[PDB]
């Protein structure tokens, strides 16, 4: 990229690679920080955020709501079988729980 413009635009991403680089420097993680690490980290963060937002938007469209709410995020995280593994030990505020019912607890078929 020969464009000597803003580094986020130079990398073609949306998250601020400059702010990420600053946080790496002032985080007290290592004495030196490579110039390519912030781009990689911002790309990973942007991908994760984008896929969370996509799945939450799908949940909201299922709910016929045009405004993402923590319930949508909770449903998105628990519905996915590996985002759960990533964040199962974690708790989302005001998100509730996934709708599940034990088979035995169902009423007797009469």
């Amino acid at each position: 990229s020969a464009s000597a413009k803003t580094r986020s635009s130079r990398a073609g991403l949306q998250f601020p690679v400059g702010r990420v680089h600053r946080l790496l420097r002032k985080g007290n993680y290592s004495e030196r920080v490579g110039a390519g690490a912030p781009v990689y980290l911002a790309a990973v963060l942007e991908y994760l955020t984008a896929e969370i937002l996509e799945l939450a938007g799908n949940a909201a469209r299922d709910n016929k709501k045009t405004r993402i709410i923590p319930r949508h995020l909770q449903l998105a995280i628990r519905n996915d079988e590996e985002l759960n593994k990533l964040l199962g030990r974690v708790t989302i505020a005001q998100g509730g729980v996934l709708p599940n019912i034990q088979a035995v607890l169902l009423p007797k078929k009469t």
Binding site: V90, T91, I92, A93, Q94, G96, V97, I101, Q102, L105
Partner: protein
Amino acid sequence: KVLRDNIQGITKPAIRRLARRGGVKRISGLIYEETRGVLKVFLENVIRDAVTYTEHAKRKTVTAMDVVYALKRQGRTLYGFGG
């Protein structure tokens, strides 16, 4: 300021909805007493960590940021309250 009688303030129907959200349908009477002890230990641990952080931080007003730190440190991290 004198204040007492904490744990029995919680209502048995509150534990009822908590179990209902858990998904269990039939509840014994002995559950309500031990649930109170569970809340005892959980709350005492969490706010002990919180007050430790606050007293370290020259501050005696326990903020939400500190309790979020306590939950994160215990591995029961909570979201939606900053950080």
